[PDB]
Design a protein around this ligand. Sequence first.
Ligand code: AZQ
Ligand code: AZQ
Ligand code: MYR
Length: 582
Amino acid sequence: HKSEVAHRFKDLGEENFKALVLIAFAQYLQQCPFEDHVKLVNEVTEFAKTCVADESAENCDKSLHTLFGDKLCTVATLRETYGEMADCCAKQEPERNECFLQHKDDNPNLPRLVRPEVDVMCTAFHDNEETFLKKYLYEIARRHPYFYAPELLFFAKRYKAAFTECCQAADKAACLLPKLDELRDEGKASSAKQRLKCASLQKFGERAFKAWAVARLSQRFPKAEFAEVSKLVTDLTKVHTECCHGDLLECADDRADLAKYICENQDSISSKLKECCEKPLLEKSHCIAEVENDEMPADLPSLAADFVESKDVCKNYAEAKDVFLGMFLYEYARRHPDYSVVLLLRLAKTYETTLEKCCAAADPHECYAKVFDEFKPLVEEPQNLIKQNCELFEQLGEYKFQNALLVRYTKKVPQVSTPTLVEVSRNLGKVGSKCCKHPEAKRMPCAEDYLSVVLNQLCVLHEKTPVSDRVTKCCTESLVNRRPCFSALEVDETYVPKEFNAETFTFHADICTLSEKEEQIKKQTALVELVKHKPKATKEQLKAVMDDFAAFVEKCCKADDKETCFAEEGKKLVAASQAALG
Ligand SMILES: CCCC1C(=O)N2C(N(C)C)=Nc3ccc(C)cc3N2C1=O
Ligand SMILES: CCCC1C(=O)N2C(N(C)C)=Nc3ccc(C)cc3N2C1=O
Ligand SMILES: CCCCCCCCCCCCCC(=O)O
């Protein structure tokens, strides 16, 4: 109505409002201490209540951006702490706001957040729950300036549930830690995806984004009309554009609008939206974004009717290429919730290439008549990888599967650093343990989603520390040829064995007191190193060596006077192994 703040306050509720204002300020004033942020929040909340009480009270008519900017420009240390940014206060809206986004550091030099001992966490939680959770929101928000504030709040609440549930438990640690580790993972995954989507829109452009969207939305809402999907793809692209620019308000209003639109037209979009559409304003978007795929229409024609057999294919195509290709994708995707999005893009691209040639050929219909046959090998490549890799994972376990990946990628890109190879391999191993659990129907989408982030993170590191032209080739390839380009990597013939280093292969009894995760990482680091030294070793030779090693440990650890055993037997092992691998 007349007062924007009061409106949001009433819509949101005091609790969420305060949470959001806190996240907002922390995302910009990433450097100010916690105590300072709490004060601003109180002041803004006070102001808010004033406007709710009397919508005509002073300033209550000012816009959110203006109000937000004015308070921001209140920090006296502004110039001394952010310098350049303070200059923004001299500008006027909307340049002031714009000037602020331009100075929001996407990655500050803040210290890593250390997880305290479970007992101190629980105690702090019980003694001052309110500030325990706000501190949490503060620390996270300031480290992820672009994380969509509301998603952040969603994470906060699960964070609180974990403490409520686990601090009462008989065995707090066994209950809390795992929930915390999972939260961190999901949080980092979610954050990495948001950045990934924004980066994509930048490099690859809008068209490619809309394409990605048509496909994903079609698998989700297979009953919706193409017209509806187009409309959505359009608004969703605007949303991400604004959300990527960093402006929280616009981002939020766009998402709110999209969600209501969807909920009002839900009976013609998807049946699986009842649940999501009842939830509170703050959770609609979140819910809808993760809503389960709907059941697909029962009486659905063969694509080849409208896209191969038809006589007016080139006519309909020439008439509006993108649109036609859009309908193709839409048709292909809603019949395949089991394909990864990028696979659907590959087919679409293939179809496009074909139409581009064939529509300028003698008899078009004869040129593009067998195009669908060109899809089969494209669809099959990713399918067999899943099958082959998931079976291997069912046999060996996550850990031994991770060891297999280690041997496999170290041989492919020996140049990469050992610690990097270890991390990426463990993560890939995780993708296997979380996706192979599902039935074929959902394996590909699962892998696609996790692999996209793992691969991008891979590219980022490497981008900073280049080591191989091949990796950079794949990393700068189309985000549709990316995974395939990495799958096509072959053993490196050139790589010359690393000079033997005795130190690298000597172990002390400390490895026994080490924690599993610690032990594994130590063993795996030796593994990569072994492979870098003897890149021609075969699975059998390696297998054999690892076995001896297995014993070696179990033998030394769990045996009177361990230190000695690791220096005596260790000498033997290392010597024998070298001869074995000549
Ligand atoms: C190095 C990562 C440490 C780290 C961590 O444990 N976090 C956490 N906790 C405490 C559950 N929750 C998060 C949720 C989302 C994001 C984006 C980040 C975190 N957060 C971290 O940054
Ligand atoms: C893969 C899920 C398809 C998908 C979907 O339904 N989305 C949606 N709505 C409300 C349509 N809003 C978004 C808001 C935030 C994020 C991060 C993602 C989406 N968006 C999607 O990407
Ligand atoms: C709303 C209609 C837009 C859909 C456009 C269809 C484009 C499909 C081609 C695949 C795009 C991948 C980009 C590329 O690598 O060339």
